[PDB]
């Protein structure tokens, strides 16, 4: 990713955390199968079918470069992983048409890298202070 | 296994009539892999009862060869001919319990002409034998009778 397109042209996210601990029993005469409960050996991620492993956001310009990162990446994992390109704006959600309708409306406020969505639910007062752009004369 | 027995089906190719209601429908569900069933026609019932109708009379299994035998056990409910019997079966109706029980389990042969599928133990919907094949029970029973 970085060399072909730059230290900065993408956001790569490992979407899977290796919470499960593996054990080795571990044979040092020999003791046996007597009391064989293992010691902790390593960690792993328990992954499902259709479960996402990596996600990447870039600019449309960079699609091909991106796919090749993730294609180069497979060769490091057991199993079959597919590269799917998504209808969805970046890491948000909402297909780009529905995200766009929103951003061009004021309903979206930039948070820390991610984003905050105008609700029709809290107090009128402080949703007005939170999303001024949404209810304003404005262009 | 219990259901098969409570429905008097403790031998391969033996067959009986069941009145359909919820309390019996859930029985047929439990049993579905082990039976073939459907909606019998008058024709089929007429011939099942004529050819292989036997009655239960002090345990013993007795061929219905004269109407006197039917009247002597089923007369008390109306039903004094073999056609009185067929009618209480096909129309279901008020003494169906008692009429139907008097009829011993029908002992059919294997079907003459075959099962028409390569494998019986799948569902009729899946290529054949077992489960409710609906109207198509007549064709099957006729070849077994």
């Amino acid at each position: 990713m970085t060399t072909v397109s730059g230290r900065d042209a993408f956001h790569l996210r490992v979407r899977v955390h290796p919470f499960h601990v593996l054990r080795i029993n571990k044979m040092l005469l020999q003791q046996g199968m007597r009391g064989a409960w293992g010691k902790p050996h390593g960690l792993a991620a328990r992954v499902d079918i259709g479960q996402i492993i990596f996600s990447v956001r870039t600019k449309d310009s960079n699609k091909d470069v991106v796919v090749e990162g993730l294609r180069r990446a497979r060769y490091k994992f057991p199993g079959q992983q597919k590269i799917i390109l998504s209808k969805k704006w970046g890491f948000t959600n909402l297909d780009r048409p529905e995200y766009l309708k929103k951003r061009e409306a004021g309903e979206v406020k930039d948070d820390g890298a991610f984003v905050k969505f105008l609700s029709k639910k809290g107090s009128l007062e402080n949703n007005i202070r939170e999303f001024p752009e949404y209810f304003a004369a404005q262009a | 296994r219990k259901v098969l027995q409570l429905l008097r089906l403790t031998r391969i190719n033996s067959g009986t009539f069941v009145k359909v209601t919820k309390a019996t429908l859930e029985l047929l569900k439990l049993i579905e892999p082990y039976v073939a069933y459907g909606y019998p026609s008058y024709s089929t019932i007429r011939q099942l009862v004529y050819k292989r109708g036997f009655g239960k009379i002090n345990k013993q299994r007795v061929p219905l060869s004269d109407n006197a035998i039917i009247e002597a056990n089923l007369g008390k409910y109306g039903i004094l001919s073999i056609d009185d019997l067929i009618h209480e079966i096909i129309t279901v109706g008020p003494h169906f319990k008692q009429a139907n029980n008097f009829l011993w389990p029908f002992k059919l042969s294997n079907p003459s002409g075959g099962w028409g599928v390569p494998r019986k133990f799948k569902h009729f919907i899946q290529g054949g034998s077992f489960g409710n094949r609906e109207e198509f029970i007549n064709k099957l029973v006729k070849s077994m009778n």
Binding site: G50, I52, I84, S86, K87, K88 | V20, T21, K22, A23
Partner: protein, 159 residues
Amino acid sequence: GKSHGYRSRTRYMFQRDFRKHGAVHLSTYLKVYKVGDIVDIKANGSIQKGMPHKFYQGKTGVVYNVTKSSVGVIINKMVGNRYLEKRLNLRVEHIKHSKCRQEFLERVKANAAKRAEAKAQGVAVQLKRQPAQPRESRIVSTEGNVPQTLAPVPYETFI
């Protein structure tokens, strides 16, 4: 080694219901119990005295005794190939009238009554329950309901 205390395995069974901890409301102490009543046993783990052992959780028996603070209950328990008769002294916090004996008594009345109006009309009754029956013919109309025809749908990813 292994462990089989009296309240073994009971962490979720004797726990109180979510947001329902604390004092037990007085209704529980106002129910009256009679010999021959049918109660359902269900432990209240906030009351440690007069408490059913966990085998009897979820079981229903008959009252055979009434005492200052408890009823005695008869449960039939299967041990081996045979039921043994068991009697329990449960405090009242752990017991509750069986609601189905109530529908039943209600119906027995309903039944007596149906029988009455039938005789004082001199007609047939029919008092026993039939199970759900097959369903009789209908004519469905199409006025305002011309059938909408559907087809299967193409695969698609939403991710």
